[PDB]
Amino acid sequence: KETAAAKFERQHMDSSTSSNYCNQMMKSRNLTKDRCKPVNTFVHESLADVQAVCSQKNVACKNGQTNCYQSYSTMSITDCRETGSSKYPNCAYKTTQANKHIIVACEGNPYVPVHFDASV
């Protein structure tokens, strides 16, 4: 299949790029293949900037692990949230643009993002 790092890029990175954004992106990145992923976040910053977060503010992960890092500066992100009318395979999403600090979990050598934990 793919590596944890590759999966993170597929699920959360969009350095390139509306109200239909999430509906298209969640489908394009295969996040609605088996079921409708409840929520997801896309980061519009460069891969370098996001990877750099692994050496920024160390914070506790939501699950209790200690390998999470928070960005020192806010980042342009888009939050995707499944609607009520949404019914698989026709997953409907609410697109919300925002500028917040991101928190990602990092692992490996090279030490890179493998999980999007939260946006604050």
DSSP string, 31-57: TTSSS--SEEEEE-S-HHHHHGGGGSE
Are residues 92 and 82 in contact, defined by beta-carbon separation less than 8 angstroms?
A: yes
Locate 101 and state its tokens. Answer: 């600090």
Structure-determination technique = X-ray
Q: Where are the domains of the chain?
A: 1-120
Identify the CA nearest to 94 among candidates 82, 106, 105: 82
What gap in Å lies between CA 89 and CA 37, rounded to an integer? 11
Strands (DSSP E) found in the chain: 39-43, 57-59, 68-70, 75-82, 93-100, 102-107, 112-119
CATH superfamily of 1-120: Ribonuclease A-like domain (3.10.130.10)
Q: Rounded distance, CA 14 to CA 69, Å? A: 19
Q: Is 12 a catalytic residue?
A: yes
C-alpha–C-alpha distance, residues 13 and 50, integer Å: 9
101 labelled catalytic: no
Which residue in 77, 95, 115, 117 is the catalytic one?
115
Resolution to 1 decimal, in Å? 1.9
